[PDB]
Amino acid sequence: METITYVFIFACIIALFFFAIFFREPPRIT
Amino acid sequence: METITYVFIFACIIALFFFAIFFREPPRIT
Amino acid sequence: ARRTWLGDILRPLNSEYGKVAPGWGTTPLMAVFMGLFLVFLLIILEIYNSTLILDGVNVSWKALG
Amino acid sequence: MEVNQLGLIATALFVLVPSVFLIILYVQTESQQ
Amino acid sequence: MEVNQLGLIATALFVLVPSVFLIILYVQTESQ
Amino acid sequence: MEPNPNRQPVELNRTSLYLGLLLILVLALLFSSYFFN
Amino acid sequence: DWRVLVVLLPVLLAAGWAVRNILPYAVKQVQKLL
Amino acid sequence: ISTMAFNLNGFNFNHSVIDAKGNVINTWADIINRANLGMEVMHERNAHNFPLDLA
Amino acid sequence: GTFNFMIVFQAEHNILMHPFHQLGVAGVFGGALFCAMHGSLVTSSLIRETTETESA
Amino acid sequence: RGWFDILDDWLKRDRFVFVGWSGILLFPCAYLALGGWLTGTTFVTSWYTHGLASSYLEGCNFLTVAVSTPANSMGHSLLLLWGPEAQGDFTRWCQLGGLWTFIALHGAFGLIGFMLRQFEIARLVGVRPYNAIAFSAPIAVFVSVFLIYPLGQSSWFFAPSFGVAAIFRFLLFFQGFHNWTLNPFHMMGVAGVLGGALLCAIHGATVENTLFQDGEGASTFRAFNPTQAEETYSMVTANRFWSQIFGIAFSNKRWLHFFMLFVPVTGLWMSAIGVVGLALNLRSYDFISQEIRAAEDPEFETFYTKNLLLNEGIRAWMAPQDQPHENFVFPEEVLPRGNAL
Amino acid sequence: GLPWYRVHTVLINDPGRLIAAHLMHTALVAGWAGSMALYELATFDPSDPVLNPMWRQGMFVLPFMARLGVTGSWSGWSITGETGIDPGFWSFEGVALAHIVLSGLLFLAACWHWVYWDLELFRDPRTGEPALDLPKMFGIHLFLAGLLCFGFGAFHLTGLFGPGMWVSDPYGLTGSVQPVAPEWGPDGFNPYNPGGVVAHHIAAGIVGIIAGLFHILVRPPQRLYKALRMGNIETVLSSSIAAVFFAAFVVAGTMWYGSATTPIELFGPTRYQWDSSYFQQEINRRVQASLASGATLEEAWSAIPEKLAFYDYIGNNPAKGGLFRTGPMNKGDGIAQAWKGHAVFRNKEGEELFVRRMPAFFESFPVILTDKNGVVKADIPFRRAESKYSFEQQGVTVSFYGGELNGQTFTDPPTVKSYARKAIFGEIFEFDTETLNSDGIFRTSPRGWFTFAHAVFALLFFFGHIWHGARTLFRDVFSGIDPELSPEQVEWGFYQKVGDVTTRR
Amino acid sequence: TTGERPFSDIITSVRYWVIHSITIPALFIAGWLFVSTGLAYDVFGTPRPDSYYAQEQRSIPLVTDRFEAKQQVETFLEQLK
Amino acid sequence: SYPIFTVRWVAVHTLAVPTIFFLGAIAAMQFIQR
Amino acid sequence: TITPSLKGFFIGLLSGAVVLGLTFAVLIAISQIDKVQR
Amino acid sequence: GGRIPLWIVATVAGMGVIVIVGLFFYGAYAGLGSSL
Ligand code: CLA
Ligand code: CLA
Ligand code: CLA
Ligand code: CLA
Ligand SMILES: CCCCCCCCCCCCCCCC(=O)OC[C@H](COP(=O)(O)OC[C@@H](O)CO)OC(=O)CCCCCCCCCCCCCCC
Ligand SMILES: CC1=C(/C=C/C(C)=C/C=C/C(C)=C/C=C/C=C(C)/C=C/C=C(C)/C=C/C2=C(C)CCCC2(C)C)C(C)(C)CCC1
Ligand SMILES: CC1=C(/C=C/C(C)=C/C=C/C(C)=C/C=C/C=C(C)/C=C/C=C(C)/C=C/C2=C(C)CCCC2(C)C)C(C)(C)CCC1
Ligand code: OEY
Ligand SMILES: [Cl-]
Ligand SMILES: [Cl-]
Ligand SMILES: [Fe+2]
């Protein structure tokens, strides 16, 4: 259960990476 | 730990009661 | 709407929305397959249930050896 | 008492996950008004 | 391995509870 | 490409919140004995 | 056997007796149906 | 519940059906009674010293 | 304890075979039936005052 | 103007009992399920399947009369008249429990017919089909208790027999063998049935005591008109009453009546699920933590341990007579008994 | 705003985001299968398929992989128990990684179809409105389904180009993956004939190709398009649900009763094999045959393989479990280590006595010994004061034949009774209770859990059928009846035909 | 309101009571005889008071076979002859 | 001018006819002696 | 070959079929005599 | 036609009921089902 917890948390981080890059608030120029 | 759990859930219910009554959405006519 | 190479290839497969054979068309034939299928499922069921007993159909684990 | 240890995480999640979902939807409802 | 079995619930709420707080604050922002 | 015209907003009112919470807490109170066993 | 005729004989007079009391008025209803 | 408090009990058809010789012919009532018996003999298993549970 | 009370009760009183418990079951089943009926009959005949995207 | 529409026409005419396309399934099957229960309770024995008398003809009364389940030996056989068990003989069929499957299957199909009837009438009259949906709650109970549960077991023998006391025996069976009262899916059923009955009484009594005075006389019934648009009791005075007695009250008449649908329908659905578990002997029979302690600690007693003693009493005392095909022989010395009793 | 119970209706007229939702669902299912096999491999012990088979360790997808011929691990072991193997890539480990890579590639495709929701393909070229031609779609898909079902049975199951499927003898002793030849005769409709499963997919595969072909070329009739609202994707969900619960009931039943596709070395035995004393009949046939052939009693029972005797024990009966007794069967009675031997009871007169076995219904059961004629001769009494049949009065003894205890007789009444207490469960095993801290209470098998879950879902889905079906035929009043419905349409005798306004008298 | 003839009018009518004062006792008598004659016992297989058990027998004649079941009960009956 | 024989007629007699008959049989049954 | 249960099967099959056709025969007949006016 | 007053039909019929039911209650004490 300890191995699982570590891999689960690492997997959520990588999923976060994907939305942080591709689903960011896009920057705009005013 | 069973006891703590049983009684924490019970106590959450009593608090919900409190807000359900005194902090209800107040019925407004027509 | 976006056109794509693949979209264009599949296009005629989503081209006839709403087109119908008039009246009853093939309903009477579908009806035949439906009743045939029912009778076939009955057989299948009454074999499993052992109200239909047939020659050389031993409905037991012992039909594995 | 010799009791199932995952009973606790099961009960804690059984409450927290659905409860949090409801709160999320209530609060973004109030902010619309 | 003979690990602390309250470690799972501790890690679990450590993640969920502050995580839930932030989601709540983000959504009710997007809807105004 | 246009924005999706099918998007809609969700609502949960306060009575539904109160009803939903009672359902879960009471469900938890009933199943909890069985989870601990 | 014979208990069957015994049992069935009341129901024939029951049906016979209705059929003759009700015949003339049933003849009307069927005519009306075109 | 209030009249069964004064022990005016439900219908009792235990052995109400017997044959020409007088054998008992059981019904569902008699099965019910076999289960009532198993409840009877076990409840409060240490509390009775005499053969009838009159209260 | 509730179930203990209702088990001993049946052993000592044959309450299922009592006509007043049978009227209670009829009262109680009947009540659930009529609740669902009335609830479904009123619900079935709500007058249209809403769109598909909102609660009736 | 084909024949199919000529028949559509005649089926759907407005008459004292509406017929419909659903009538074709509904009516034969409902009449036959009922004809068979009355046929069998008045005339037919359970001697050869159960060792029981079970008809008025035998000496039974309306409480003890039943159409009983087939012998365990029959297994899950459909027990068709023309089938390998009864071999066309009507008399033998009845003696084998043939009418049980007869009632149960025409029953099942009749319930379908009925529910299709609720769909059929609602479509013609132009109302929403919520009465039909509510009727799924009875259907689920019927199929789970009468079909699924014995199909999980050794045979039809262990389904309910159709009769008042026979059903009473079934209630006790589930207590002694399944400890069904301890099952949370039954408890949710109880809260829905009793909750429904509560809701039923309280909503009927509220309306009756929040009425408007629309007539002069003391019978308040006369003063309703079926066509009036105006509501006939005060939702405002009802809401204030219950807010102050009970703290919360309904404010929305649509939610109220939908909640009367929801509560009993759902409880029956939950109990159906539980009985499905019991098809498989998947009971909530024990709490393991309790058994470990009581095994090790003879001073440790609860109502949970007391109730299992009672369950143990029921099993050993009713089983030989209730399951005749098992030839259970329990000499006196082995029977569980408390002191003196 | 939408209510919570309706958020997913935004997809109704949005074919691309419907495809994106459907891809994401597919990603999570394949992901789950990947994850579940990984956890099974990390906890499976494959060192003893005789007394610690997969079905005792609460394995759930392992047996489904083995059913179609994945039998071994990159580690060198196989479930049949042979060592040294190399399964190539399509090992348990390899299947799990496929489904994980598949899940990842489905995730990405879903993002793509969600962002690029507005494809011209989805537009009706006449009106420019989104529209799906469901009848032609059914034809195309029904044709795909027929090809795969034909090819599954023509190549995989035959072993023409594939592994075949798990087959065993009738007593689940010699299972393996093997090619199967189709049974075209009437015995192929027998659920216990595996050749029938081959016939079925070949034959029904061609019927699907032909019907798919019919359904692509031929338009639905006007009467039927209108009756079933074939412009409404929700009629498909209604009928689709009904088909799925049909199928879920079927797979629950064949799991419980047993068929050629639910073999007892993958799923455990059935409750019926205990009801009918199926393994006990065979076990005894063998000993009588050793014995007419003149072997000693010790020899005749030592000849019985432990795998067979383990089947003849109620702790492997799936109908002895409980809804909240969690985990693997091993968590209850422990890990089976060794058959102890077949217990023979003799009274003091040297009659052979027979422990009445416990039926599946009974959580507890009394200890009653009987003779070949069925006559009670000993028991363990509850009330001691008036007892005549006690082991002490009747001088019961136990002798063991075969197994770990072969050739040993016990006479002291407390030992004798203790084995009498186990005999009611059938054959008597030694278990390892410490390794998993076994609590001693019977759990059910994967046969139990799979049947339960699928029966419960099937019933729940019937309500889905009903709901979504109602919503298809009545969509025009979903939001409420017409406010200008006149009491003439609804009161009696107004219209000769109910609801048809053209029949006013 | 559906065009059939109202019930309250059918059972105050002379004609109705003239038919049914015959048909109702005929049915009551018919069913009586179905019992009093013994035919109901025979049609249905139901044991008479003297034929639940054989004289010195105290065994239920319980069906124990599926496909020999018919012949089983027939054998029990001849054990009463 | 009403009809005598309707669907309603049939429904009614479908139940009633065998009710009275069944009442006859059950009446007779009270006089059966063991 | 053609066993008794299979004879029974067809017996049930022909029986069932008669009942629906007789019933549907009856129902088509009435529907034509007794029509709605329109 | 409307001849027999309805109150008459209701009294008599009702008496018909009580009659048969009391027959079935009498039978619970006599003959089969009586325990005697
Ligand atoms: C109309 C509704 C209806 C329904 C749904 C049922 C349903 C059922 N009945 Mg009931 N029954 C009905 C009406 C109905 N009955 C009526 C009106 C009667 C009184 C006559 C009965 C009397 C009755 C008895 C006495 C029994 C049943 C039984 C049964 C069960 C078995 C049915 C079976 O195997 O059929 C199988 C056959 C079919 C389904 C027929 C299919 C029709 C095919 C498709 C047409 C074939 C045409 C032909 C081959 C072509 C021409 C050939 C050429 C020679 C001309 C089933 C639950 C049995 C039961 O309950 O056992 C437990 C039983 O014993 N029924
Ligand atoms: C407070 C006490 C209490 C309460 C309120 C309930 C409530 C309930 N019990 Mg539990 N029960 C209790 C105590 C209680 N129980 C105890 C102490 C025990 C002992 C263990 C049990 C044992 C028990 C068993 C064994 C079962 C229940 C079941 C149920 C449910 C019955 C559902 C129903 O409507 O059936 C009524 C039946 C139907 C709705 C099915 C179809 C009905 C059709 C439509 C009838 C049509 C009639 C027809 C038109 C002709 C009628 C005329 C005819 C009479 C002549 C309900 C949730 C059942 C269950 O869980 O179901 C899944 C079940 O099998 N109970
Ligand atoms: C059909 C689905 C299915 C089936 C049949 C199984 C079956 C099995 N699994 Mg697998 N499993 C599944 C899905 C499934 N699993 C999924 C989806 C996951 C991921 C979550 C897992 C994760 C998993 C793990 C991690 C393990 C298993 C193990 C096992 C075994 C023991 C399971 C057990 O104790 O049951 C316990 C079941 C219950 C206690 C019943 C739960 C049902 C709840 C109580 C109902 C909820 C009611 C609801 C709130 C009511 C309110 C409704 C109302 C308000 C409207 C068994 C072979 C175990 C094993 O032995 O493997 C080695 C193990 O350790 N499984
Ligand atoms: C293929 C199966 C299928 C599909 C695609 C749908 C699709 C739909 N359903 Mg239907 N439905 C189904 C099965 C299905 N249903 C079944 C089996 C039932 C009976 C239980 C129902 C009963 C049902 C009702 C009663 C209603 C719908 C409604 C809807 C619509 C909106 C649903 C929504 O927003 O959910 C929103 C849901 C949530 C926000 C959270 C749900 C959380 C649930 C309780 C537990 C989740 C468990 C977990 C995720 C694991 C999944 C379970 C496992 C089986 C795989 C949508 C078109 C609604 C509708 O008509 O709208 C117009 C509606 O009112 N459905
Ligand atoms: C228990 C709840 C009922 C509460 C009682 C009052 C109900 C409310 C009344 C409405 C307003 C006033 C009308 C009162 C009028 C009233 O309630 O009853 C009176 C009515 C008879 O009325 P007539 O047509 O004789 O006259 C009209 C009367 O209203 C006199 O004014 O009784 C019947 O309908 C008898 C039919 C039963 C015999 C039919 C047997 C055949 C049926 C077969 C079909 C089987 C079932 C269908 C299958 C699913
Ligand atoms: C099964 C079968 C069948 C069928 C049959 C039928 C269909 C039947 C019917 C039957 C019926 C249809 C009957 C009925 C009868 C009933 C009765 C038996 C009644 C009684 C009642 C009473 C007694 C009542 C009284 C009262 C009381 C008690 C109280 C209240 C009031 C009053 C007055 C009501 C056939 C042929 C197909 C074949 C196969 C088998
Ligand atoms: C991205 C990507 C990737 C990766 C992948 C991944 C990593 C995956 C994941 C996936 C997975 C890993 C998933 C999983 C899933 C799971 C789930 C989905 C589950 C479900 C569950 C549930 C639903 C349950 C329920 C329940 C409970 C909880 C309790 C009891 C009862 C029941 C059973 C009902 C790759 C490299 C390939 C490629 C590139 C991209
Ligand atoms: O039912 Mn049995 O009876 Ca009324 O008492 Mn005598 O035993 Mn004890 O105390 Mn509670 O219980
Ligand atoms: Cl007690
Ligand atoms: Cl005392
Ligand atoms: Fe109301």
Which of helix, strand or coil describes residue C52? coil
Ligand 1, residue J82: give the atom nearest the CA.
64
DSSP character for O12? H
Determine the Cα–Cα distance for residues J245 and J233; give it in Å rounded to an integer: 19
Residues of K in contact with J284 (CB under 8 A): 322-324
Q: Say if residue K176 is in the same domain as residue K296.
A: no
Tell the CATH topology of C1-51: 1.20.5
Locus of tokens 């009594």: J205
By residue count, chain C amounts to 65
Put simply, whether M20 touches L (Cβ < 8 Å) is: yes
Alpha carbon of H42: minimum distance to chain M alpha carbons (Å): 37
Residue I39 CA, ligand 11 centroid: distance in Å: 7
Q: ∠ CA(G2), CA(G8), CA(G11), 5° rounding?
A: 160
Containing H/E element for K343?
strand K335-346
Q: What letters, b where the CB count within 10 A reaches 16 and e where it falls short, cover K385-413?
A: eebebbbeebbbbbbbbbbebbeeebeeb
DSSP character for H4? G
The residue contributing the CA closest to ligand 4 atom 15 is K464
Return the axis-axis angle of helices J253-279 and J184-208, rounded to nearest 10°.
160
Put simply, whether H49 touches J (Cβ < 8 Å) is: yes
Last residue of a domain, one of K443, K459, K476: K443
In chain L, residues 20-49 whose CB comes closer than 8 Å to chain J: 35, 40-47
J81 in ligand 1 pocket by Cβ < 6 Å?
Answer: yes
Determine the Cα–Cα distance for residues J100 and F32; give it in Å rounded to an integer: 41
- For residue K379, the cross-strand partners are K368, K390
Token pair, residue C60, equals: 């037991």
Residues of L in contact with H19 (CB under 8 A): 49-50, 52-53
Token pair, residue H20, equals: 């020409």
Query: Strands J66-67 and J162-163, how do they pair?
Result: antiparallel
Chain breaks in chain F following residues, C–N > 2.5 Å: none
Question: K260 and C61 in contact (C-beta within 8 Å)?
Answer: no
Residues F32, B6: C-beta atoms closer than 8 Å: yes
Question: K326 and D5 in contact (C-beta within 8 Å)?
Answer: no
Residue L11 CA, ligand 5 centroid: distance in Å: 15
Q: Say if residue K47 is in the same domain as residue K153.
A: yes
Residue J333 CA, ligand 10 centroid: distance in Å: 22
Q: Say if residue K404 is in the same domain as residue K262.
A: no
Listed in sequence order, the DSSP H helices in J212-297 are 235-245, 253-279, 288-296
Determine the Cα–Cα distance for residues K371 and F33; give it in Å rounded to an integer: 46
Containing H/E element for J8?
helix J3-11
Q: Domain count of chain K?
A: 2
| Cβ-based burial of J23 (10 A; exposed 0-12, middle 13-18, buried ≥19) | buried
Residues D7, B9: C-beta atoms closer than 8 Å: no
Candidate from K26, K240, K467 with most ligand 4 atoms within 8 A of CB, to mutate: K467
Determine the Cα–Cα distance for residues I17 and J168; give it in Å rounded to an integer: 8
Dihedral angle sign, alpha carbons of residues E27, E32, F3, F7: positive
DSSP-derived secondary structure for C11-22: GGGG--TT--BS
A 10 A CB-CB count for J338 gives 17
Query: Strands F10-11 and K2-3, how do they pair?
Result: parallel
Token pair, residue J90, equals: 């009507």
Question: L13 and O2 in contact (C-beta within 8 Å)?
Answer: yes
O31 Rama class: left (phi>0) / alpha (psi -120 to 50) / beta: left
A 10 A CB-CB count for H33 gives 24
Q: Say if residue K465 is in the same domain as residue K318.
A: no
J112 in ligand 2 pocket by Cβ < 6 Å?
Answer: no
Interchain touch J–N (≥3 Cβ pairs closer than 8 Å): yes
Main-chain phi, psi angles of I3, to 5 degrees: -70, -40
**Closest partner residue to E9 among D9, D23, D24, by Cβ?**
D9
**Closest partner residue to J287 among F30, F31, F37, by Cβ?**
F37
Question: J274 and K452 in contact (C-beta within 8 Å)?
Answer: no
Determine the Cα–Cα distance for residues H7 and G18; give it in Å rounded to an integer: 55
For ion ligand 10, residues whose CB falls within 5 Å: H 48-50
CB-based contacts of F37: which residues, under 8 Å, 6+ apart? D3, D4, D7, J287, J288, J289, K324, K325, K326
Residue C36 CA, ligand 6 centroid: distance in Å: 37
Token pair, residue K171, equals: 């007593």
Annotated binding site of M: 13
A 10 A CB-CB count for K315 gives 20
- Which whole-number Å values give the CA distances from K416 to J333, K206, K420, in the listed order? 19, 63, 6
Locus of tokens 């069927």: G30
* Host domain of residue K404: 271-443
In chain J, residues 308-337 whose CB comes closer than 8 Å to chain I: 310
- For residue J211, the cross-strand partners are J233
Last residue of a domain, one of K402, K421, K443: K443
Q: How far is CA K225 from the centre of its chain?
A: 38
Determine the Cα–Cα distance for residues H54 and H49; give it in Å rounded to an integer: 12
Give the best residue of J10, J15, J29, J32 to mutate against chain M (max M CB count within 10 A). J15
- Which whole-number Å values give the CA distances from I35 to I28, I42, J267, in the listed order? 10, 11, 13
Residues of O in contact with J60 (CB under 8 A): 33
Which of helix, strand or coil describes residue K14? coil
CB-based contacts of J187: which residues, under 8 Å, 6+ apart? F30
**Quick one: which ligand is closest to N13's CA?**
1
Candidate from K442, K449, K457 with most ligand 3 atoms within 8 A of CB, to mutate: K449
Token pair, residue L70, equals: 């018919």
Q: What letters, b where the CB count within 10 A reaches 16 and e where it falls short, cover J262-298?
A: bbbbbbbbbbbbbbbbbbbbbbbbbbbbbbbebeeee
Determine the Cα–Cα distance for residues J195 and I36; give it in Å rounded to an integer: 11
Which of helix, strand or coil describes residue J210? coil
- For residue K428, the cross-strand partners are K341
Q: Is I21 annotated as a binding residue?
A: yes
A 10 A CB-CB count for K503 gives 18
Determine the Cα–Cα distance for residues F29 and I26; give it in Å rounded to an integer: 30
Main-chain phi, psi angles of K363, to 5 degrees: -60, -40
By residue count, chain O amounts to 36
DSSP-derived secondary structure for K224-273: HHHHTTTT-HHHHHHHHHHHHHHHHHHHHHHHHH--TTS-HHHH---SHH
Residues of O with CB under 8 A from a CB of M: 20, 23-24, 26-27, 30-32
Determine the Cα–Cα distance for residues J261 and K3; give it in Å rounded to an integer: 19
What is the C-alpha radius of gyration for chain O, rounded to an integer number of angstroms?
Answer: 16
Determine the Cα–Cα distance for residues K72 and K91; give it in Å rounded to an integer: 6
Residues F25, D15: C-beta atoms closer than 8 Å: yes
Residues J287, F31: C-beta atoms closer than 8 Å: no
Determine the Cα–Cα distance for residues J228 and K352; give it in Å rounded to an integer: 86
Which of helix, strand or coil describes residue L13? coil
Query: Strands K376-379 and K165-167, how do they pair?
Result: unpaired
Determine the Cα–Cα distance for residues J307 and J313; give it in Å rounded to an integer: 10
What residues does ligand 5 touch, defined as CB less than 6 Å away? J 17; L 6-8; M 11-12
**Quick one: which ligand is closest to N12's CA?**
1
Determine the Cα–Cα distance for residues E27 and O34; give it in Å rounded to an integer: 76
Residue J304 CA, ligand 9 centroid: distance in Å: 10
- For residue K2, the cross-strand partners are F10
> Looking at residue K299, which CATH number applies to its domain?
3.10.680.10
Question: K431 and K340 in contact (C-beta within 8 Å)?
Answer: no
Q: Say if residue K94 is in the same domain as residue K240.
A: yes
A 10 A CB-CB count for L1 gives 10
What residue in M sits closest to G15 (Cα-Cα)?
Answer: M17
What residue in F sits closest to J249 (Cα-Cα)?
Answer: F15
**Closest partner residue to F31 among J184, J287, J288, by Cβ?**
J184
Put simply, whether D3 touches J (Cβ < 8 Å) is: yes
**Closest partner residue to B20 among J236, J239, J248, by Cβ?**
J248
CB-based contacts of N36: which residues, under 8 Å, 6+ apart? J9, J10, J13, K496, K497, K503
Put simply, whether M19 touches O (Cβ < 8 Å) is: no
Q: For residue J257, which amino acid is it?
A: H
**Quick one: which ligand is closest to J56's CA?**
6
CB-based contacts of K340: which residues, under 8 Å, 6+ apart? K400, K403, K404, K405, K428, K429, K430
Sheet strands (E) in O1-36: none
**Closest partner residue to I8 among H32, H37, H43, by Cβ?**
H43
Residues J61, O33: C-beta atoms closer than 8 Å: yes
- At CB < 8 A and 24+ separation, what contacts does H11-15 make? H11/I14, H11/I17, H11/I18, H11/I19, H11/J63, H12/I14, H12/I17, H13/I17, H13/J61, H13/J63, H13/J64, H13/O35, H15/O35
Q: Say if residue K74 is in the same domain as residue K203.
A: yes
CB-based contacts of K331: which residues, under 8 Å, 6+ apart? K58, K436, K438, K439, K443
Determine the Cα–Cα distance for residues J45 and K48; give it in Å rounded to an integer: 54
Q: Say if residue K340 is in the same domain as residue K243.
A: no
Determine the Cα–Cα distance for residues K411 and J124; give it in Å rounded to an integer: 81
- At CB < 8 A and 24+ separation, what contacts does G23-27 make? G25/M4, G26/M4, G26/M5
**Quick one: which ligand is closest to K328's CA?**
3
Q: How far is CA L2 from the centre of its chain?
A: 37
- Which whole-number Å values give the CA distances from K87 to J212, J245, K92, K160, L69, in the listed order? 83, 73, 9, 18, 53
* Nearest CA among K378, I3, K7, K261 for reference residue J284: I3
Last residue of a domain, one of K410, K427, K443: K443
- Which whole-number Å values give the CA distances from K136 to C12, C24, J42, K217, K218, in the listed order? 10, 18, 58, 8, 9
DSSP-derived secondary structure for K302-320: HTS-HHHHHHSBGGG-GGG
In chain J, residues 58-77 whose CB comes closer than 8 Å to chain H: 58-61, 63-64, 66
Residues of H in contact with L58 (CB under 8 A): 23
DSSP character for C53? -
Cα of first residue to Cα of last residue in chain A, in angstroms, is 51
Q: Say if residue K175 is in the same domain as residue K93.
A: yes
Query: Strands K335-346 and K352-355, how do they pair?
Result: antiparallel
Ligand 1, residue N17: give the atom nearest the CA.
42
| Cβ-based burial of K436 (10 A; exposed 0-12, middle 13-18, buried ≥19) | middle
* Nearest CA among K57, O36, K342, K297 for reference residue H20: O36
Locus of tokens 């309603």: M8
Q: Between H and I, how many CB-CB pairs are < 8 A?
A: 46
CA dihedral (J166, J172, J173, J178) in degrees, to 10, reads: 150
Determine the Cα–Cα distance for residues K95 and K35; give it in Å rounded to an integer: 11
Locus of tokens 């009507």: J90
Q: Say if residue K261 is in the same domain as residue K360.
A: no
Method: X-ray
Question: I23 and I16 in contact (C-beta within 8 Å)?
Answer: no
Candidate from J141, J266, J268 with most ligand 2 atoms within 8 A of CB, to mutate: J141
Determine the Cα–Cα distance for residues K21 and J238; give it in Å rounded to an integer: 46
Determine the Cα–Cα distance for residues K318 and K270; give it in Å rounded to an integer: 6
Residue K27 CA, ligand 7 centroid: distance in Å: 8
DSSP-derived secondary structure for K389-444: SBHHHHT-EEEEESGGGTT-EE-SHHHHHHHHHHHTTBSEEEEE-TTTT--S-PPP
CB-based contacts of O27: which residues, under 8 Å, 6+ apart? M29, M30, O33
A 10 A CB-CB count for K377 gives 18
A 10 A CB-CB count for J68 gives 26
Residues N8, J6: C-beta atoms closer than 8 Å: no
Return the axis-axis angle of helices K446-473 and K233-257, rounded to nearest 10°.
160
What is the C-alpha radius of gyration for chain K, rounded to an integer number of angstroms?
Answer: 30
Dihedral angle sign, alpha carbons of residues K280, K283, K285, K287: negative
For ion ligand 9, residues whose CB falls within 5 Å: H 43-44; J 306
